[PDB]
Amino acid sequence: LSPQLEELITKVSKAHQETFPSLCQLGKYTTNSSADHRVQLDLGLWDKFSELATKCIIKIVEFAKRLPGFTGLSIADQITLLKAACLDILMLRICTRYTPEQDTMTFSDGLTLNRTQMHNAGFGPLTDLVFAFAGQLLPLEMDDTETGLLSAICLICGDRMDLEEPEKVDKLQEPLLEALRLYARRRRPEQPYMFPRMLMKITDLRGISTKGAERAITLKMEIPGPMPPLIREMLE
Ligand SMILES: CCCCCCCCCCCCO[C@H]1O[C@H](CO)[C@@H](O[C@H]2O[C@H](CO)[C@@H](O)[C@H](O)[C@H]2O)[C@H](O)[C@H]1O
Ligand SMILES: CC1=C(/C=C/C(C)=C\C=C\C(C)=C\C(=O)O)C(C)(C)CCC1
Ligand SMILES: [Cl-]
């Protein structure tokens, strides 16, 4: 045991909780927009969804800047990491707020959309794969600390193309991996496969995000103007 590792766990947990409202703390609310049938795109829903996405991108940057050592990387490397991982983290975030009984996902302001509305907001042919990912995330029963640490591990990764100092990024990731294993095993000692299961979710997350990037291309043709600039920074 080391005090430094325990401090890292709590720092990351706090950074996550303070940039990602929990489903339980949110005042959920609904919309009646295009709620029953799948359409190509409901522009009202796209407007609301894309605005929320911009806000969450800013929150993910805020989260990143609170991760120990992140701001010690070159600005170029910080941007490179954020561009590489933002969509992964957005996916993890929305899927964490999945309510299976109601077949809904809840955004950071409490906006709660059913599957059809998620489709109509822009997810389109990606919707059911996203819900399937959320469904397969559930049994892991991850808590906020674990979700925070996993998000940090997804972001701080030395394999990203065009990194100036990949070995430096590698070194920053090391304690995050150690922290997640220590925490996961302590919390649920009778479920020792939880750590490796969590790590394998990273690969699943990358897979769904690649599909997300593909969806963005087709979505660009359906929208009446360009996507919001921070969304373009994430995708383009
Ligand atoms: C994925 C690609 C990544 C590319 C890197 C982009 C990093 C840019 C992040 C913005 C950094 C500056 O952030 C600073 O100004 C932003 C714009 O006024 C604010 O951004 C936002 O803040 C509020 C709460 O987060 C939001 O409800 C508002 O939409 C907006 O004002 C930040 O609260 C502020 O701390
Ligand atoms: C942004 C964006 C996309 C993905 C959004 C995802 C995957 C999650 C959004 C999460 C939010 C916005 C959570 C919150 O508010 O807590 C897709 C690929 C559809 C293409 C259009 C732009
Ligand atoms: Cl570009």
Residue numbers in the entry: 182 to 417
Pull text from the paper.
To investigate the consequences of S371 phosphorylation, we crystallized a hRARγ LBD mutant bound to 9cis RA and C12m in which Ser371 is substituted by a Glu residue, which mimics a phosphorylated residue (hRARγS371E LBD). The complex crystallized into the P41212 with one monomer per asymmetric unit. The complex structure was solved by molecular replacement and refined to 1.7Å. The detergent mediates a crystal contact in the region of the receptor involved in coactivator binding as described for the RARγ wild-type. The hRARγS371E and hRARγWT LBD structures are isomorphous and very similar with a Cα-RMSD of 0.47Å. Indeed, in RARγ wild-type R387 points towards the solvent, while in RARγS371E it forms a salt bridge with Asp340. Next, we investigated the effects of the S to E substitution on the region previously identified as the cyclin H binding site in RARα. This region is located over 40 Å from residue 371, and also shows a strong network of electrostatic interactions involving two salt bridges: one between R387 and D340 and another one between R341 and D269.
Retinoic Acid Receptors (RARs) belong to the large family of nuclear receptor proteins (NRs). Forming heterodimers with Retinoid X Receptors (RXRs), RARs regulate the expression of several target genes via binding specific retinoic acid response elements (RARE).
